[PDB]
Amino acid sequence: DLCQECEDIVHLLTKMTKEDAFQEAIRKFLEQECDILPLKLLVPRCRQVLDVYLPLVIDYFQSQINPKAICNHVGLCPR
Amino acid sequence: NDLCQECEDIVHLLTKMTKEDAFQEAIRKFLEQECDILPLKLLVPRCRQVLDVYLPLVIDYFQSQINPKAICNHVGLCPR
């Protein structure tokens, strides 16, 4: 049941993004990855992209989202 | 505070989902669509080719002999 597993992942992400520890951990991990391969080459200006977009993703998962619509958008739930 | 367990749960869900071909097909279609538009079109040079090369590798990685706690340790959500 892909739809339900995707919805569960979305729910878990909504829970995890509420903790500052989560943001700090993912920030440090991605900052380390941005300085080495593969990301260093695959994503130009990796660190700046990270600085700008990690807070936006955190906010997004803390906002009023529609899990079934999200999972439909990526093709894992029907409409 | 129990981020470690939530991370392990996400990893387990991903391992389950990567077992289905419908998953690979759907994520492939979604990311192929995204590679042709903003933001990815600009953030990831040669997005479509990067996708073609790396999506099977990520799928295999989550289908392989992995330890969810080890992944979560690597990304800093379980302590070690």
Ligand SMILES: CCCCCC/C=C/CCCCCCCC(=O)OC[C@H](COP(=O)(O)OCCN)OC(=O)CCCCCCC/C=C/CCCCCCCC
């Ligand atoms: C490039 C190839 C790399 C190999 C694979 C490695 C995967 C990397 C994941 C990067 C994917 C970046 C996709 C960015 C596309 C995007 O910005 O669309 C998000 C849109 C736009 O939202 P808004 O403009 O704010 O308006 C609607 C309000 N809800 O939001 C969505 O509805 C979709 C959210 C996607 C997150 C869903 C996560 C659920 C988990 C599913 C299973 C796990 C697979 C995840 C793979 C990535 C797919 C997101």
Ligand SMILES: CCCCCC/C=C\CCCCCCCC(=O)OC[C@H](COP(=O)(O)OCCN)OC(=O)CCCCCCC/C=C\CCCCCCCC
């Ligand atoms: C570019 C930053 C933009 C900020 C927004 C973030 C949006 C989407 C996430 C972008 C995905 C980029 C991830 C880079 C992964 C990478 O290149 O690292 C390679 C390494 C090399 O693997 P190995 O050393 O062989 O593993 C041994 C450990 N047992 O990959 C890894 O180690 C595994 C990392 C996978 C972690 C996923 C676990 C899921 C946990 C929580 C999900 C919620 C957080 C999502 C962010 C994590 C992104 C990976």
Ligand SMILES: CCCCCC/C=C\CCCCCCCC(=O)OC[C@H](COP(=O)(O)OCCN)OC(=O)CCCCCCC/C=C\CCCCCCCC
């Ligand atoms: C790894 C499995 C974990 C599953 C968790 C899902 C992880 C990430 C979900 C992605 C977050 C989507 C939420 C959208 C919320 C939002 O408002 O952002 C939408 C914005 C819209 O962008 P714009 O505002 O239009 O900017 C235009 C100016 N350039 O889009 C995004 O946030 C997406 C940014 C992500 C940047 C991706 C860069 C990394 C991409 C590919 C790296 C591939 C590495 C693979 C290596 C694997 C090695 C084996």
